[PDB]
Amino acid sequence: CSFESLVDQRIKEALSRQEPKTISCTSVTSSGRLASCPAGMVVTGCACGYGCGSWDIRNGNTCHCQCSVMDWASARCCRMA
């Protein structure tokens, strides 16, 4: 019983039924030193062959993987789904 009230509980309806956003991650492995995430995704980490924990991210999407010898690199990607 009130005009500006109906409008509010009306919102606490839709507001309370939009399902909320969440993180989804996936991995991309590639041969060599470079492994890139798809556009629309951030790189949160890199893994690397030869037990190589030295890596660096290039163009904000690619895992450069940086030791004497490198079979494969890998890029963890995340984003809001």
Next chain:
Amino acid sequence: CSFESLVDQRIKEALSRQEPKTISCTSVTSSGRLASCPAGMVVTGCACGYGCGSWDIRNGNTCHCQCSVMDWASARCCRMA
């Protein structure tokens, strides 16, 4: 002043009342070569003993450290909160 408008001033009032969620991360550390984020959390990266930077993710939430010898693993775990 217009039958709509007042409505938008109502949405765009107590909508600025919404408290935006933020990333919250945490680590999980286990002996051997596996470490899992509790479900509801994604895995963003892994760490391994023996300076082992070769890992891979198994079953969407599990850090698998993968060098020959291996004593602990940690998963880095993030969630919206």
Next chain:
Amino acid sequence: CSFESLVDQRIKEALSRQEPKTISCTSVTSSGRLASCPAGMVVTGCACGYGCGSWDIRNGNTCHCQCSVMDWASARCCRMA
């Protein structure tokens, strides 16, 4: 066409016009064995020199590369933008 609806045709259509939230990430690199994210960011992982997979995160913001000889260290940092 009916006057509970006139309302949500604004609600469920300023939600879509809103400001959809997004992840951003970035690396911080420092000589030594430590590296720190700025405030407002979660650490999603670390890199190390001499190829370390072994690292841990302290005080919620500091990559501690934890091998023995240690060049440099890296943190990966993320926030909602």
